[PDB]
Ligand binder design. Structure first.
Ligand SMILES: N[C@@H](CC1CCCCC1)C(=O)N[C@@H](Cc1ccc(O)cc1)C(=O)O
Ligand SMILES: N[C@@H](CC1CCCCC1)C(=O)N[C@@H](Cc1ccc(O)cc1)C(=O)O
Lengths: 697, 696
């Protein structure tokens, strides 16, 4: 099924669900804090779910990569080796910014929100301020009670607003990670690819204080006791079987302008992919000189690889289906339907006009902005900026601070300063600074008009760069102790410091505030215009029959469909892989270097009671026609009776383009089978204490 | 599953009927009758006669040399089509192009064995005794003017057969599709399925007006074949019986375990690394000078094919544990022999003797490769070949080194003409530089080519640069200079101040002893190799395995069925279709189909060739046949002997079968006759050929 359906749409997908094979009633799914929906949880930009009454939480390996990285060293490398905690007291802190969000409540605030936007009238900046003050106020009242964190979501370009209330668990700990050769089998070669043979899973545990409320890490913290948790399935999952996912997809752009798509396709994806592949070459090369670099920058590298490869796959996805054409046609098809309507269609035409005008701004300045943006987001310069910004925002009363820099956000900023001690190496940061500076000075002279940066460079040669990196080399912000002091410090200490990173942060901060202000004016303009056009586009879509659901916005969504393969001229991809496919791809070298205990077990056909008689072996990964995207990683896959049969982690090569234009023929989710998870834990990287917790011993 | 010699038709009679063959088995034992007499050898490819006026069909990649010889940068036939509507338009395919038509096969085993035993004990004497026997049989068989003959060793030399062939020497190019069809997917799709490649082309064979073979004259008239193939009327579908007859070159399924271990660990990875380095050099020089791109097009393509093939076999080796299967079969044979008593002692001695041959070849292997490659650069290779030939002219004809006799002169002279369209001083110098950079990088112990270090005067980069400048002053770039030395004698070469010629004069005594040494080993292996392979075949038969000699450039027969293959997560289907070619489109090489094709497919112009079981027209198909190099261009015949396509490649998991056959995943890729027809109807038309073939 196409669709990232919101739970409020359960009425209209009820029939389709049952017809696909659901054997629960949809009313049981409509209880979002009941069984099974209430066990689905957000981590941030991943999904997860509870699977035990003592607060055990399962998700993807690549979602846990962060925490695993944080706790790794070059001597004791848990990314490579995996990890297991036989008792509570062995479990490792996932870090200060690890979160588990448990849904308390959703409420519609559409009428209020719109009334606040209307109360600002004409002026764009006011329209943006008013929405911002509405958000803050709704969030303050919702978060009055301790241990809740609330968020406001814009749907359908602003036609709908809903407020989510979550309990925010702040003490999360690692319990189990398989070896990297299992969790990340096939690495960057197999990424976005079927056939796939990857054991992408890991386990956390949620803790709270003795008193029951979320607390930061503490030795006397205790396991959280969830209302609801999923059970592993006792019914073997075969081809054509019903499946569904619930989760927190991030962003889709299916209702975007043909122009937005065109700027993305011909500038952003090729540019980013190109430069990422350069930076990655540089990190790999440094990482062989010193294995501390390899480990401290491994989360950055994994994430950049994923993005760069994704972008190359979307470009090609666009040729496969000519998305420039379809966008053009559907866009002109709508502008026509509106032309027909009895004077009531004229306001949406005016909206289209405004939205067009947004796109042209950057043609000459867009390489520059990337390069400057990326330099300002290297570690020491980025810390310096964050810190200096906060000191200004601390001037103001709390209600008027920028989102990001309120009281309720201090915890998180402070956690980031801490986390960077595990992700920072001076000699590597200097190479990154050098790289993006080298790309700025290589611009045409006309496009190199960042005045602060031109002053600090005093020229456009390679020697200007070298000399500025040497000067930025005298910063103290590579010390945690220093960072934590600056975290407390007054705006005036920043303005009077000779630390070079700080000096630079102070020099750039006026332009940064001005860029930020223009952005808010654009948001302000489109806050009556996007919702108008997106309603028209949707009414037109409902005209031709067809499915209408909102673009993803980090909120909870349901997708459903069936286990099934897909086809290309000469090829039919079957819906399952098995143990033998894993062995068959053995090269004895990264990324195909499975543990020996795996190769042994497969050679001896030690299936441990998990084989599917229809396949002849234990299945590994599987395909289905569910609609997911970034953020859906780690989402639980449920069978017709709401038991866990796999985790979502990826899609196939053809699916990546469907962020923009969905293709029902060749769009597929890749999930890891609950049977492979259990197999690995029995026969390869044993977790006996954990197989007992999940009642599988 | 096997590369069966015609003499083995008895055994496979049952399997052939079982597989779906309608013809009788003994229709096929008729090698000059039907439909086998239609199958021809091109040298190192296969083809077939398909019209009573001497039309021949092969792969575009086999014809690629002819097309390239006939191409310039201004007029590139590779990129563009070629069609010849009348006889007078058909281009010469080059002096060295041939068609061999089989006359006769007689078994001469006992004479051959007699001849080597006759020399008794000395190894070098055994080498010469069989060189002498080969020549005698050849010169008597080749005595009638039209004919060419070859002696084949089978099964390590347990069998010897003589092949008699009518030698057609005027071959002309009739039709080539554009390169974006005949080589669709270039190096990305090479060795891969699913495949979408229109790999075919047409030659015409000519004789003089006597009916006798003659070199290119405009007086010559098309040969009239006794037998030719008809295109199928019956549509080919999945499960249908298919067979191929052709000339597979070499297989190594009967290699010793150490032979394999060294190919896998050294030869293939080394050659793959160095060929890729050189390919990038050539592609870069090619982008600079369009002249270089065209003249070196056959080299690049050949080097790419080899390079990707070697990468493929190494992955096969790990996918089937080749190393462990070879070891297991060797150990099992060695043990089956240890208690045959006296029936097994001879074979064990022979194994031991073969292992020494391998130990000697290890010591020198890295130098042998770089010096070999250097000595086969165009100018140096010429100098060596020409000088060697004048040395050989001194001697009477029967006493000359095979390849340097009267019969071989026409070939040698052809090579020097063909090199004209395949040589550019500045590229040859980059190739000379490359192989020399690899020699001087060797550790000092292994840089023991006396002559070459003398000519180097150092071993840094700028001593290489100085030697290549010194060789810059040669005139062997000019055709008429090469042709002059083709005529001259020993004394002139020894008198020459041409750098390359002095070089060849200097190296020739080393080369001659290195070659004397080779013949001593060849002499040792003439009794060992047959003994040991007789043991392996003995053991294999007791286990009831399929038993058949390694390919040796002779005519062979293979059979099976139209079917795909599976992998974990994937079920490959037997055919591709027109829409598959349109879907791979980029508009940039090598996925840049001609506009005519995109349009014909976009508007569903199936020219009445659609097969219903697919929504459109077939492009390529798969089947479980046993092919290897030389089987390219081989006709693929349906169960009733008609033609349904040409063999042109294998899938990725197949290439490893050179050394260890995997039946589950070894498949042939062929181009379907309907795609051929479809192309000459709706894309780059050839109505004149549709007429000649009874498809209009
Ligand atoms: N491709 C994954 C990233 C990992 C794959 C396993 C090896 C290590 C890297 C990814 O980005 N997944 C997304 C989920 C997703 C699924 C399907 C589609 O079309 C798009 C995204 C995520 O992490 O949220
Ligand atoms: N891969 C082909 C040559 C390609 C040249 C570029 C254009 C497309 C074809 C090849 O090497 N074919 C072999 C035959 C062969 C078939 C099957 C197996 O397993 C091995 C070899 C040939 O040229 O004879």
């Amino acid at each position: 099924a196409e669709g990232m359906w919101v739970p409020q749409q359960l009425p209209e997908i009820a029939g389709p669900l049952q017809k696909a094979g659901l054997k629960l009633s949809p009313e049981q799914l409509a209880n979002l804090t009941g069984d099974p929906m209430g066990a689905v949880v957000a981590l941030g930009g991943c999904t997860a779910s509870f699977v035990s009454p003592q607060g055990l939480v399962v998700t993807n390996h690549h979602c846990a990569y962060g925490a695993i990285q944080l706790n790794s060293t070059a001597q004791k490398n848990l990314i490579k080796d995996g990890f297991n905690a036989p008792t509570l007291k062995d479990e490792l802190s996932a870090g200060p910014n690890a979160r588990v969000f448990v849904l308390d409540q959703i409420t519609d605030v559409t009428a209020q929100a719109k009334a606040a936007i209307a109360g600002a009238g004409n002026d764009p900046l006011a329209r943006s301020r008013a929405l911002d003050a509405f958000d803050k106020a709704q969030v303050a009242a919702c978060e009055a009670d301790a241990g809740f964190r609330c968020r406001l979501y814009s749907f359908s370009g602003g036609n709908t607003y809903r407020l989510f209330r979550n309990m925010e668990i702040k003490d999360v700990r690692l319990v189990y990670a398989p070896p990297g050769s299992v969790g990340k089998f096939g690495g960057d070669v197999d990424n976005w690819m079927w056939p796939r043979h990857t054991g992408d899973f890991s386990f956390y545990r949620a803790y709270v204080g003795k008193d029951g409320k979320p607390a930061a890490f503490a030795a006397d913290n205790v396991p959280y006791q969830p209302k609801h948790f999923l059970k592993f399935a006792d019914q073997p999952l075969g081809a054509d079987d019903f499946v569904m996912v619930a989760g927190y997809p991030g962003r889709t752009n299916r209702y975007a302008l043909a122009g937005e798509f065109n700027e993305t396709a011909s500038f952003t994806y090729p540019t980013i992919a190109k430069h990422y592949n350069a930076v990655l070459k540089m990190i790999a090369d440094a990482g062989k000189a010193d294995a501390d670099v390899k480990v401290k920058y491994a989360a950055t590298a994994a994430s950049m690889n994923n993005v760069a490869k994704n972008y190359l796959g979307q470009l090609e996805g666009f040729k496969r289906i000519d998305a420039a054409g379809q966008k053009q046609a559907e866009e002109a098809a709508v502008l026509a339907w509106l032309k027909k309507q009895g004077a009531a269609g004229k306001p949406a035409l005016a909206a289209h006009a405004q939205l067009l005008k947004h796109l042209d701004t950057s043609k000459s300045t867009r390489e520059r902005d990337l390069f400057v943006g990326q330099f300002n987001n290297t570690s020491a310069v980025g810390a310096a900026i964050t810190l200096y910004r906060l000191s200004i925002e601390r001037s103001k009363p709390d209600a008027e601070r920028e989102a990001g820099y309120q009281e309720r956000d201090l915890t998180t900023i402070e956690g980031g300063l801490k986390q960077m001690d595990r992700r920072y190496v001076a000699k590597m940061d200097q190479q990154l600074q050098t790289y993006w500076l080298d790309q700025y000075v290589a611009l045409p002279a006309a496009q190199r008009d960042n005045e602060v940066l031109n002053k600090w460079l005093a020229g456009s040669d390679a020697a200007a760069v070298k000399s500025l990196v040497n000067k930025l080399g005298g910063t103290e912000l590579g010390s945690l102790d220093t960072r934590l002091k600056w975290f407390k410090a007054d705006r005036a200490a920043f303005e009077a410091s000779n630390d070079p990173a700080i000096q630079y942060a102070v020099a750039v901060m006026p332009a940064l505030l001005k860029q930020e202000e223009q952005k808010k004016i654009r948001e302000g303009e489109s806050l009556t215009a996007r919702p108008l056009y997106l309603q028209a586009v949707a009414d037109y879509k409902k005209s031709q029959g067809e499915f209408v659901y909102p673009d993803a916005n980090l909120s909870l969504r349901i997708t459903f469909g069936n286990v099934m393969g897909y086809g290309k001229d000469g090829v039919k991809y079957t819906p399952f892989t098995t143990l033998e496919g894993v062995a068959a791809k053995e090269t004895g070298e990264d990324p195909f270097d499975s543990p020996k205990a795996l190769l042994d077990a497969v050679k001896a056909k030690r299936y441990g009671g998990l084989e599917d008689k229809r396949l002849g072996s234990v299945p590994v990964n599987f395909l289905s026609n569910l609609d997911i995207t970034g953020g859906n990683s780690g989402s639980p896959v449920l069978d017709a009776n709401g038991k866990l049969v796999g985790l979502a982690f990826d899609g196939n090569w053809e699916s990546v383009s469907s962020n923009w234009v969905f293709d029902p023929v060749m769009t597929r989710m890749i999930a890891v089978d609950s049977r492979y998870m259990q197999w690995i834990m029995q026969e390869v990287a044993p977790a006996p204490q954990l197989l007992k917790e999940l009642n599988l011993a």
